[PDB]
Amino acid sequence: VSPKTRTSNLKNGLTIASESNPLVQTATVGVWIDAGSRNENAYNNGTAHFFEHLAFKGTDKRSQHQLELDIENMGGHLNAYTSRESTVYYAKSFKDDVPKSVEILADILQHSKLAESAIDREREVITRELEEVNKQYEEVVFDHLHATAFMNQPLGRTILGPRENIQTITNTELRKFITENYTADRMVLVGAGAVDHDALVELAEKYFSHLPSSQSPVPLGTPIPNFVGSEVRLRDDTMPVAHIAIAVEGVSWTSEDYYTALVAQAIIGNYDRAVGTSRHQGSRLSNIVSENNLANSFQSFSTSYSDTGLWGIYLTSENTTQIDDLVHFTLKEWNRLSTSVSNLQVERAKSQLKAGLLLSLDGTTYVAEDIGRQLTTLGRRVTPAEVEAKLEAVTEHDVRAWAQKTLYDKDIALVGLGPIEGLYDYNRIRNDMSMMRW
Amino acid sequence: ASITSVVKTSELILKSPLLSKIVVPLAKTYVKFSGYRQLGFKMNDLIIEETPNMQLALRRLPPTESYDRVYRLIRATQFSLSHKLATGNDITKPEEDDHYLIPYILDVEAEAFEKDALDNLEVV
Amino acid sequence: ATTFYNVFVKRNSAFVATILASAFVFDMTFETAIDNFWDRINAGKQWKDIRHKY
Amino acid sequence: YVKKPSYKIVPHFLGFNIPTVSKWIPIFGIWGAAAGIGALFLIEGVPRTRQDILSKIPIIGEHWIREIPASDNPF
Amino acid sequence: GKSTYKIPDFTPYLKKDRNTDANRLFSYFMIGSFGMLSAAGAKATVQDFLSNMSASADVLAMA
Amino acid sequence: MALRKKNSLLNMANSYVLDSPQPSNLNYFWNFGSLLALCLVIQLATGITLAMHYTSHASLAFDSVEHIMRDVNFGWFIRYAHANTASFFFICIYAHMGRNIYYGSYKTPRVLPWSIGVIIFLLLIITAFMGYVLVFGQMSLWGATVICNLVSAIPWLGEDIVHFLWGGFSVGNPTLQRFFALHYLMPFVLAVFALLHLIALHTAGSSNPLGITSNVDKLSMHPYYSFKDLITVFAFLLMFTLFVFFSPDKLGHPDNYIPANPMVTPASIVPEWYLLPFYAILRAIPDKLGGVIAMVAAILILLILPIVDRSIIRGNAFKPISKLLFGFFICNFLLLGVLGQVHIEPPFIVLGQICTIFYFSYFLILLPMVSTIENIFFYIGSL
Ligand code: HEM
Ligand code: HEM
Numbered sequence A: 001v002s003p004k005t006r007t008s009n010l011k012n013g014l015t016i017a018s019e020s021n022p023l024v025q026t027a028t029v030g031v032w033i034d035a036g037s038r039n040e041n042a043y044n045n046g047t048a049h050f051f052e053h054l055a056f057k058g059t060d061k062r063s064q065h066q067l068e069l070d071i072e073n074m075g076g077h078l079n080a081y082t083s084r085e086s087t088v089y090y091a092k093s094f095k096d097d098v099p100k101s102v103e104i105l106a107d108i109l110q111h112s113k114l115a116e117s118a119i120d121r122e123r124e125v126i127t128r129e130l131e132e133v134n135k136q137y138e139e140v141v142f143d144h145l146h147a148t149a150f151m152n153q154p155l156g157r158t159i160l161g162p163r164e165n166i167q168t169i170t171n172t173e174l175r176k177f178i179t180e181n182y183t184a185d186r187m188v189l190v191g192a193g194a195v196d197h198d199a200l201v202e203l204a205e206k207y208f209s210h211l212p213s214s215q216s217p218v219p220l221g222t223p224i225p226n227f228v229g230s231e232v233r234l235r236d237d238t239m240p241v242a243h244i245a246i247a248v249e250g251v252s253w254t255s256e257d258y259y260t261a262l263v264a265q266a267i268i269g270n271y272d273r274a275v276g277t278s279r280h281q282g283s284r285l286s287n288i289v290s291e292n293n294l295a296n297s298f299q300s301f302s303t304s305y306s307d308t309g310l311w312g313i314y315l316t317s318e319n320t321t322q323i324d325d326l327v328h329f330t331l332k333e334w335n336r337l338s339t340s341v342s343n344l345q346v347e348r349a350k351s352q353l354k355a356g357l358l359l360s361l362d363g364t365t366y367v368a369e370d371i372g373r374q375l376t377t378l379g380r381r382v383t384p385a386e387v388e389a390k391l392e393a394v395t396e397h398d399v400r401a402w403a404q405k406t407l408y409d410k411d412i413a414l415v416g417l418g419p420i421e422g423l424y425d426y427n428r429i430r431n432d433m434s435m436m437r438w
Numbered sequence B: 001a002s003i004t005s006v007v008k009t010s011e012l013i014l015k016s017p018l019l020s021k022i023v024v025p026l027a028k029t030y031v032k033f034s035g036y037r038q039l040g041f042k043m044n045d046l047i048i049e050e051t052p053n054m055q056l057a058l059r060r061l062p063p064t065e066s067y068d069r070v071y072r073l074i075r076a077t078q079f080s081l082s083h084k085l086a087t088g089n090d091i092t093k094p095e096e097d098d099h100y101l102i103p104y105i106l107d108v109e110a111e112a113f114e115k116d117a118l119d120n121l122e123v124v
Numbered sequence C: 001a002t003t004f005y006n007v008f009v010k011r012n013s014a015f016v017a018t019i020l021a022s023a024f025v026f027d028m029t030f031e032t033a034i035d036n037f038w039d040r041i042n043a044g045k046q047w048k049d050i051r052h053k054y
Numbered sequence D: 001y002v003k004k005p006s007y008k009i010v011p012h013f014l015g016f017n018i019p020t021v022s023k024w025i026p027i028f029g030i031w032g033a034a035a036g037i038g039a040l041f042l043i044e045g046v047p048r049t050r051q052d053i054l055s056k057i058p059i060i061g062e063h064w065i066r067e068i069p070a071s072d073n074p075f
Numbered sequence E: 001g002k003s004t005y006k007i008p009d010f011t012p013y014l015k016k017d018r019n020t021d022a023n024r025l026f027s028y029f030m031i032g033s034f035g036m037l038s039a040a041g042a043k044a045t046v047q048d049f050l051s052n053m054s055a056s057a058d059v060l061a062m063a
Numbered sequence F: 001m002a003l004r005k006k007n008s009l010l011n012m013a014n015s016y017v018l019d020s021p022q023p024s025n026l027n028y029f030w031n032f033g034s035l036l037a038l039c040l041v042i043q044l045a046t047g048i049t050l051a052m053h054y055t056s057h058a059s060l061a062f063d064s065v066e067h068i069m070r071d072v073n074f075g076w077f078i079r080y081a082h083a084n085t086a087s088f089f090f091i092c093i094y095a096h097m098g099r100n101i102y103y104g105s106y107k108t109p110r111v112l113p114w115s116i117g118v119i120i121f122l123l124l125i126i127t128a129f130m131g132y133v134l135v136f137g138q139m140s141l142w143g144a145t146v147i148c149n150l151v152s153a154i155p156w157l158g159e160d161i162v163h164f165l166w167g168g169f170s171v172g173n174p175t176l177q178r179f180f181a182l183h184y185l186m187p188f189v190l191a192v193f194a195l196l197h198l199i200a201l202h203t204a205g206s207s208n209p210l211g212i213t214s215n216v217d218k219l220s221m222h223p224y225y226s227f228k229d230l231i232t233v234f235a236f237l238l239m240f241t242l243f244v245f246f247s248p249d250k251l252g253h254p255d256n257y258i259p260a261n262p263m264v265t266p267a268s269i270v271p272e273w274y275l276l277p278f279y280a281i282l283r284a285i286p287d288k289l290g291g292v293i294a295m296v297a298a299i300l301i302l303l304i305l306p307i308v309d310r311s312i313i314r315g316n317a318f319k320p321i322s323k324l325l326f327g328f329f330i331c332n333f334l335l336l337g338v339l340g341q342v343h344i345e346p347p348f349i350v351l352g353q354i355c356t357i358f359y360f361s362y363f364l365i366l367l368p369m370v371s372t373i374e375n376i377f378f379y380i381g382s383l
C-alpha cells in the first residue's frame, strides 16, 4: 500500500499534488498543464511546441548561459514535453535542491524573454526537426493516423505544425498563447519522491501566486471529434520493414468504458520477436504471429483524449508477402472480442492489468507523471483500490458489448508505411471487421 | 495416435508384472514377423513424419543421427524397388534398433499438449 | 436504427435469415399483386372472363 | 502471501471448450432458422409442401388453398 | 503539395453522419434488398426451370 | 530455362507427366491410376461414338442398339468395348481403392485426395447405373424400377421425388431420355474430379509401399513410370481383347437381350456384378429406409478411415495383424458380392447379415483396436 497523494489548492486555483517516498533521495517536481497543440488554430499551429524551445532560451533575469549554469549547479536536470492535450515541465533534483528547481520552473514559465533574436535562431532548429522525424517511423505512422482519423479537426494537426507557421511565428503570438492557456486553474504543481507536501505548497505560494486565473474556470480535464474511416499509404519499397497502424475511434479518459477498453486491449496484447518470453504468451494473436513469423512486433494501444480516443494496433513486419495474413489474423482476433470472448480471456487480462497499472510506477518521474496525468485528465488521483474495483467490475459481457458497438463492422483508420504492396485496399481490410460466419 | 499415448500405455503395461509377462513376448514376435529389420530400418524410421510435430522433432535430431537416417531410408528404398532383403551388416540387429527419435518427439508433444491445456486455463 | 441494426443486421446469421424471410414474403405478395394487375389490364379477354357463358 | 497461481484447466476437445461453444449456441440457432426458412422457401412450389405445411398456417394459409375449376381442367 | 500530414480535400464526398447506425443501416438496406431480390429471383428461376423434369402435359394426359 | 518450364501451359503438363517427382519404389499396384485413365479415355471415345448412332426414345432405344450391333461398321466392337470396359473400370477402381486402403494412402497428408476419390467412386456408380438403363432391355427397365424405388424411402417427400426423377408414374420414355443426357454428362464431371484428386495429391506426392518419405530419393515420372505404365496398358489390352473379341457377353445378363416389358417381371432382378456387395448390404437390413442408409453408409464410411486408423505408421507392409485383418475384409467384400446375386433364401439371409456386420465392424471396431495394439507392439517389441 503506497503513501497517500496529498492535494492542496492556492487562491488563484493552482493545484499542488504530492506523493512522498522517504526511501529515495531524489525528487521530481514539475508543472502539468491541461493545454497542448489542440488549443492552437490552423494559423498558430506549432506555437506550443515553439514555446517549449524558447522556455529554455533565457528569462527576464537569467540569460540562456546563466540558466544552463543554474541547472548544472543544482546537479539534476530539467525536461519538458508537449503533446496534443498536455504540456509538462519538470525538474529532477536532489532532496534539498527542490526549492531551487521550483524557482527555475516558475521563472521559465512566467517570465521568459521570447526575444526576436532567439525566435529567429530556433526557427531554423525547428525547420530541421521537420526533416528528421522522417526517420522515427512509429512517430510518422501515429502522426498520419491522427491526421486521417480526425481529418481537418484540431486533434488531426501535428505538434510541430506546418513549415509555413514555423517561418511566421512571432513573439506576440507566443505570448498570447501562453497567456490564454497557461492559467492557474489549468496547472498542477506535482512533487514525487523526497518532497514534503507542506514545503511544496509554501514554494507554490512563493513562486506561482501571481499566475492569472482564466475568465471561465472549467474543471481539470474538460474538453466534437468526428472520426473518419480512411487510409494513408506511404509506400516506400526501399524500406525493409513495413509499419502499419489500424485504429477505430476509442474512449475518452472519463468514458464509462475506459476500463473495458483497456481489458479488451490486454486480450490482444503486445508481441516482440526479440523478447524471449514473447513466443510463450497466452494471447491468440501472439501465437499465430510467432508460429507463422508474420511480424517483428505488434503493440495494442488504447489512447485517450478528453472527448475521444483511438483504439487499435501497431504492427511492424519484414514479411512483405504475408502482410495480408498478418492483417487478416489481427482483425479476426478483434472479431472474437465480439463473438467468442468468455470469462477465460477476460479474467486472464484483468489479472495482468491489476498488476500492470501499479508496476508502471517504478520511479519518481513515473509517479509524478501518473499524478500529473490523472490530475489534468480526471481532476483527481484515483487510488489503487478504486482502480482495482473498476477493473473487477469488467465482465465478459461488458467486453463483448463494448466490442460489438466499437469494433464490430466499424470504419477503421489505417496507415501503412514502407513495403506495403501486399497491404490490400481499404474495402478488403475493412471487410475483416466482421465475420460472415457470425 | 500420439507418440505420447503409445509410450504411456506401454509404460502402464511394463509396470504390471502379469501384463508384461504376456505382452513382451508377443511384442517381440510381432517385431520379428513385421520384418522391417530385414530392410535395415530401425523402428523409429517408420513413424509417419508428415506432421508439424514430427517435422519439428526431425529438425532437432543431432546431425549425425539425421544423416544416418537419410541413408537408411535411401537404402531401404533401394531394397524395396529391387525386391531384395538386407543381408549381413545391413540387417538391423535387435541391439541396434534404438529409439533415437522418441525423446525428441515426446518433448515436442509435451510442449504442444501443455500449450493446449494452458490455452484453456480458468482463473479461479 | 441502433436497435434495428443490432437485431437484424449485426449478426450475419440474423441478416441472412431476415433476407430469406423477406424474399419469401416478397415472392408471395408480388405473385398476388401481378396476378391482379394482369387481370385488370386484360379484362374481358381471358378465359376466366368468358367462362361463365359456357 | 500467495505461493501458487490459482487456476484450473477446463475440458476441451479439438480446441473447443464449453464457455466458447456456449457463446455460439444462439448463432447456430439463427443459422438453423435461416436454413429452415431457406429450405422451405425452395420447396414452396412442391404441392405436398403446400398441402402439409403451408396451407395449415393460420390466416396466411389460405394463400396456398387454390382450386382449378373442374371446367378448366383437362386432367 | 508537399506536407503529407495535410490530408487532401475530401469535403465534396464526406458525409457528416458517417459514424451513425442510421448511416450504416441504409447501406445494409440496399445490400439486403439486393440479396432479397436475388434470393427471390433464384427461387423462381430454380422452381420454374426444374419443373421441366416433372411429368409433361402429354404424360399427365395418359394417367 | 527450358520451354517446358518457362511456358505456363507446358509447365502444367510438365508438372504432371514429365518432371513430376515420384518415389523410386512404386510397385505394380501403382499402375491402376493410369489404367483408370485408360478406361476413362476408352469410355469417352466409345461412348461418344455410340451416341452418334443411338436413339434415346423408348420406342427406338433397344432397336438402335441392335442397329449398332448389326449395321454400323464395327458397331459390334464399339458396343462390346463400351460394355466390357465398364466392367474393367470397376475392376481397376476396386484394385486402386484396395491399394489405397492397404498402403494407408488415406492417411494425412493425403486425406483430401482420398476424400475426393470417394466422390469419384460414387459418380462412377451413378454413371454406370444410368448407362445400363439405356439399352432398355428387361434388366435395364427392371433394375431402374427397383433402384429408383429406393428413393421412395426418403420420408415425407420420397414418392414425390421418385415421380420427379422418372418424369412420370413409372420408368418410361421420359426416364430413358433423361438418363441419356445425364449419362453423357456424368463422365465429364468424373474427369474433372479425377483431375482434382491428382491436384490435391500433388502437394504431398504419391505415397510408396514402405510408407516412408520419398523426399530423400525421387525419380522423374518420365521415362520411368511412363514405361512402367505401358506394361500394364498392354496387359489390360490383352484382357480386353479376350473379352471383347472372344467372349463379349460373358459379363452380361441374357435378359438384357429381351426388350423391356413392364408386364413381365424377370425371374431375378440383380444389379451388375460391380454393385452386388452394396446390394447384399441393403438386403441385410429388414427396414426399407434402414437398408438404403446402410447401403449409402457402406460407401460413405470410407471417409472415416483417416480417423479410425490409429497407427503411428503408414500402411500395412510391416504390420502382420493388420495384413490379416485386411485379407479378411477383402474376402468378406467378395462374399458380400456373391451373396448379392443368390436368391433370398436360407441360409444366405443370415450369412448376408453376418457379412454386413463384419463389413462395418472393420471400420468401427477392428481397425481402431488392431491399430492401437500394433502401436504398442512396435514400441515394446523394439525396446
Ligand atoms: C465412366 C464412363 C462411362 C461408363 C462407366 C459407362 C457405362 C455404360 C454402361 C454400363 C452402359 C451399358 C452398356 C451395355 O450393356 O450395352 C453404357 C451404355 C451407353 N453409354 Fe456409356 N459409360 C460411360 C461413358 C459414356 C459416355 C461419355 C457416353 C457419351 C455419350 C456414353 C454413351 C453411352 C451410350 C449411348 C450407351 C447406350 C448404348 C449401349 O448400350 O451400348 N457412355 N455405358
Ligand atoms: C476415374 C477414377 C480414378 C482415376 C483416373 C485415378 C487416377 C489416379 C492416379 C493416376 C493416381 C496416381 C498414380 C497411382 O497411385 O495409381 C491416383 C492416386 C490416388 N488415387 Fe486415384 N484415381 C481414380 C479414382 C480414385 C478413387 C475412387 C480413389 C479413392 C476412393 C482414389 C484415391 C486416390 C489416392 C488416395 C491416390 C494417392 C495414392 C498414393 O499414391 O498413395 N482415386 N489416382
Ligand SMILES: CCCCCC[C@H]1C(=O)O[C@H](C)[C@H](NC(=O)c2cccc(NC=O)c2O)C(=O)O[C@@H](C)[C@@H]1OC(=O)CC(C)C
Pocket (backbone or CB within 6 Å): F012, F013, F016, F017, F022, F026, F027, F030, F031, F033, F034, F036, F037, F040, F191, F192, F194, F195, F196, F198, F206, F221, F225, F228, F229
Ligand atoms: C497432359 C497433361 C494432363 C495432366 C493430367 C493427365 C493425366 C496425368 O497426370 O498423367 C499421369 C501419367 C498420371 N499418372 C501418375 O500420376 C502416376 C504417378 C505415379 C506413378 C504412376 N504409374 C506408376 O506406375 C503414375 O501413372 C495419370 O495417369 O493420370 C491421369 C488420370 C491424368 O488424367 C487426369 O487427371 C485428367 C482426366 C483425363 C482424368
Ligand SMILES: CCCCCCCCCCCCO[C@@H]1O[C@H](CO)[C@@H](O[C@H]2O[C@H](CO)[C@@H](O)[C@H](O)[C@H]2O)[C@H](O)[C@H]1O
Pocket (backbone or CB within 6 Å): D042, D043, D044, D045, D046, D047, E046, E047, E048, E049, E050, E051
Ligand atoms: C434445392 C431446391 C429444392 C427443390 C426444387 C423444387 C423443384 C420443383 C418445385 C415446384 C415446381 C412446380 O411447382 C409449381 O411450379 C409452377 C411454376 O414453376 C407453379 O405454377 C404457377 O406458375 C405458372 C407460371 O409460372 C402458371 O402456369 C401456373 O398457372 C401457376 O400456378 C405452381 O404453382 C407450382 O406448384
Ligand SMILES: CCCCCCCCCCCCO[C@@H]1O[C@H](CO)[C@@H](O[C@H]2O[C@H](CO)[C@@H](O)[C@H](O)[C@H]2O)[C@H](O)[C@H]1O
Pocket (backbone or CB within 6 Å): F005, F011, F012, F013, F014, F015, F016, F019, F195, F199, F202
Ligand atoms: C486433362 C487435364 C486438363 C489440363 C490440366 C493440366 C494439368 C493440371 C494442372 C493444374 C495444376 C496447376 O497447379 C500448380 O501448377 C504449377 C505449374 O506447373 C505446378 O507447380 C509445380 O511444378 C513447378 C515446376 O514444374 C514447381 O516450381 C512447383 O514447386 C510445383 O508445385 C503444380 O502442378 C501446381 O502447384
